[PDB]
Amino acid sequence: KIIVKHVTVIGGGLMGAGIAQVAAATGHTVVLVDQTEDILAKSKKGIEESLRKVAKKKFAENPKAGDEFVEKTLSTIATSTDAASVVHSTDLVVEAIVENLKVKNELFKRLDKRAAEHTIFASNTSSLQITSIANATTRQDRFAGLHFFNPVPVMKLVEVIKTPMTSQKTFESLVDFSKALGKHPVSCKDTPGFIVNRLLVPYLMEAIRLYERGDASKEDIDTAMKLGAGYPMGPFELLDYVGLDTTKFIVDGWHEMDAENPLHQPSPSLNKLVAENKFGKKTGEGFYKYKHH
Amino acid sequence: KIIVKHVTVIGGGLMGAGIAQVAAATGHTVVLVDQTEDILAKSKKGIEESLRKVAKKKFAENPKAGDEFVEKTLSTIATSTDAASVVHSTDLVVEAIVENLKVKNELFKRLDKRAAEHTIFASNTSSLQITSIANATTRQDRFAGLHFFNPVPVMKLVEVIKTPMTSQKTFESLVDFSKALGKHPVSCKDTPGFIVNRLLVPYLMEAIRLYERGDASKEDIDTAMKLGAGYPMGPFELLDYVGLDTTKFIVDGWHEMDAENPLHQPSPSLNKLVAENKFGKKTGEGFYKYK
Numbered sequence: 019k020i021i022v023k024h025v026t027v028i029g030g031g032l033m034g035a036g037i038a039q040v041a042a043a044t045g046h047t048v049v050l051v052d053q054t055e056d057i058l059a060k061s062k063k064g065i066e067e068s069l070r071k072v073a074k075k076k077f078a079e080n081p082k083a084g085d086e087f088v089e090k091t092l093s094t095i096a097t098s099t100d101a102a103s104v105v106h107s108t109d110l111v112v113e114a115i116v117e118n119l120k121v122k123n124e125l126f127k128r129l130d131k132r133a134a135e136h137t138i139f140a141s142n143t144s145s146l147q148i149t150s151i152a153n154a155t156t157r158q159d160r161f162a163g164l165h166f167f168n169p170v171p172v173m174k175l176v177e178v179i180k181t182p183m184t185s186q187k188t189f190e191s192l193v194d195f196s197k198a199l200g201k202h203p204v205s206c207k208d209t210p211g212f213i214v215n216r217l218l219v220p221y222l223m224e225a226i227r228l229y230e231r232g233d234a235s236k237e238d239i240d241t242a243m244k245l246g247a248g249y250p251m252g253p254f255e256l257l258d259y260v261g262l263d264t265t266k267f268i269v270d271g272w273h274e275m276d277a278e279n280p281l282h283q284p285s286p287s288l289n290k291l292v293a294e295n296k297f298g299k300k301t302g303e304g305f306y307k308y309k310h311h
Numbered sequence: 312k313i314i315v316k317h318v319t320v321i322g323g324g325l326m327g328a329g330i331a332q333v334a335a336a337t338g339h340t341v342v343l344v345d346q347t348e349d350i351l352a353k354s355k356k357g358i359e360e361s362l363r364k365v366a367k368k369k370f371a372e373n374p375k376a377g378d379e380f381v382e383k384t385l386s387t388i389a390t391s392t393d394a395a396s397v398v399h400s401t402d403l404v405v406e407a408i409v410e411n412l413k414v415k416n417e418l419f420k421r422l423d424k425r426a427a428e429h430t431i432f433a434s435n436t437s438s439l440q441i442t443s444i445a446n447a448t449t450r451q452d453r454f455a456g457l458h459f460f461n462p463v464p465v466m467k468l469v470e471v472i473k474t475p476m477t478s479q480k481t482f483e484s485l486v487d488f489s490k491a492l493g494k495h496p497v498s499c500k501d502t503p504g505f506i507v508n509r510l511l512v513p514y515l516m517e518a519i520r521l522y523e524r525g526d527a528s529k530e531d532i533d534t535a536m537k538l539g540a541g542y543p544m545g546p547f548e549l550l551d552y553v554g555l556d557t558t559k560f561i562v563d564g565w566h567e568m569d570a571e572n573p574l575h576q577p578s579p580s581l582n583k584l585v586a587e588n589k590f591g592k593k594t595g596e597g598f599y600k601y602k
């Protein structure tokens with residue numbers, strides 16, 4: 019077996035940055051990639067802030083030990099603006115850039131040419147077909163989905179997505195990598211939503227519909243699911259948390275593919291908030307208003 | 312206003328006994344009704360056991376008081392095999408009998424003729440139209456749904472289901488009672504599944520379907536929802552907890568009442584387990600095997 023040691027993370031946004039942090043804090047050598055040296059600087063700055071915050075809590079009894087912990091993790095994270103310049107010596111590429119099929123394919127089609135023969139390619143895409151992105155290369159046996167959850171340093175789950183072309187060898191290596199990250203990998207076919215979103219999102223939509231239908235208030239529904247179902251967050255609270263735009267985008271996709279399916283019918287309230295740019299906790303307001311920090 | 316103090320709980324089963332216990336534990340006078348003395352005898356025994364299990368921990372430093380707390384509570388629960396003889400002056404009737412609409416209606420239609428004027432009637436039914444029961448009486452203004460969750464003494468949520476005919480006075484009385492029970496009432500219309508089950512059951516069926524499609528294993532799905540969604544139990548673990556037959560029954564109902572809706576399509580796997588009497592934990596086996 020070829021064990022993942024060097025990881026190239028493409029995209030230093032909410033997800034990528036978190037993936038880089040966890041990979042680096044667990045002993046992997048990482049190269050975080052993004053479009054500009056500024057974006058990278060900002061992303062790395064966010065990773066530091068997050069680590070120091072974790073350190074000031076784990077090593078509360080010893081600041082020096084906390085600093086060392088942060089410095090060692092942070093120092094194993096290099097940054098480059100062109101992934102092509104470093105994949106020839108990387109073991110795994112984890113992509114977390116814009117959720118646009120064409121962009122991702124252009125990305126992987128090119129990297130395919132620079133990457134070492136054993137290099138595995140993985141996409142953290144939530145709504146696109148791993149199979150579609152994989153066929154943008156001739157490395158399908160070494161391509162799969164590696165789906166994380168926000169905040170990455172905190173959420174322990176990772177969905178390892180296998181296309182009909184992914185090799186068992188590629189699959190096992192990602193499972194191993196997942197455990198090496200301190201996460202718990204689960205397996206799922208390359209089907210829309212995979213496991214979590216496929217069971218989570220349609221439920222959140224049903225919650226919105228029960229509310230639009232006026233059967234009960236948002237507040238009551240949230241109370242009902244937290245106390246009655248034991249959920250950490252009521253559905254409206256979670257919607258604002260994951261992002262109403264993020265959610266609408268996923269559902270539009272499903273609706274597009276099967277407009278006749280009632281489960282994916284659009285939500286007026288959801289569309290309205292998104293139109294009004296009320297994306298949730300991101301913009302200080304979604305279905306609920308939040309204290310603009 | 313109408314302050315509920317004397318309560319009639321019809322049905323001393325899983326839900327019934329729990330409602331009786333919490334009502335009694337919170338200072339209400341309670342009369343528990345069921346079909347036989349043996350059933351009632353066992354129901355009241357289960358209540359005593361549950362109360363004692365608690366007292367032993369809470370009154371460790373003073374067992375005497377603990378036993379008195381239990382004594383007081385049990386002595387505030389009466390039992391009867393004849394509902395009609397009890398409702399003449401009760402403030403509230405909470406029903407939790409077999410999920411059969413006919414039986415329920417006959418029950419309430421009969422009791423409507425016995426209950427005092429101010430008496431409020433309420434059903435704990437999960438998959439039935441509160442309206443399809445209130446109309447079985449002429450007390451529609453004092454009829455509502457009051458849906459509790461198992462274990463009643465643990466679950467703090469209570470869904471107060473109001474119908475178009477339900478009085479506001481009746482509504483606020485049930486809300487006040489819910490709070491008196493130390494519970495937290497939420498409001499919903501007499502729409503199927505109310506809030507909780509309406510949003511939970513279909514999700515659980517979807518989990519089964521993902522499994523039946525061959526997309527992932529039950530274990531991973533369970534793990535996925537626990538770690539990825541922060542749920543206490545994975546869907547299959549929960550299905551076995553709430554009961555597979557219980558669930559199937561609710562899904563079939565919605566399926567018959569609207570066979571066009573994809574969320575209510577029957578599950579081969581679910582039906583099979585029910586057929587071969589594998590109902591979940593309460594049977595030692597459902598999607599998983601226990602003990």
Ligand SMILES: NC(=O)c1ccc[n+]([C@@H]2O[C@H](COP(=O)([O-])OP(=O)(O)OC[C@H]3O[C@@H](n4cnc5c(N)ncnc54)[C@H](O)[C@@H]3O)[C@@H](O)[C@H]2O)c1
Binds near residue numbers: 032033
């Ligand atoms: N945030 C979530 O809830 C979540 C959870 C799981 C998976 N995802 C998936 O992860 C991916 C990124 O999500 P995000 O929330 O981290 O996004 P984001 O907008 O926070 O960050 C994306 C980063 O990608 C960079 N980027 C865009 N195009 C690029 C290109 N051609 N080359 C290099 N870098 C490029 C941007 O500059 C940006 O810093 C998406 O595919 C999304 O569907 C999101």
Ligand SMILES: NC(=O)c1ccc[n+]([C@@H]2O[C@H](COP(=O)([O-])OP(=O)(O)OC[C@H]3O[C@@H](n4cnc5c(N)ncnc54)[C@H](O)[C@@H]3O)[C@@H](O)[C@H]2O)c1
Binds near residue numbers: 437
């Ligand atoms: N998941 C649950 O267990 C749950 C949760 C919420 C609501 N409910 C609802 O609560 C009610 C009962 O559920 P349960 O789980 O307590 O059931 P159960 O079968 O444990 O207990 C019902 C009790 O009702 C008695 N009963 C039946 N018909 C009667 C009649 N005509 N008169 C007097 N007693 C009668 C039985 O003998 C039995 O002891 C149902 O309407 C159901 O839909 C169940």
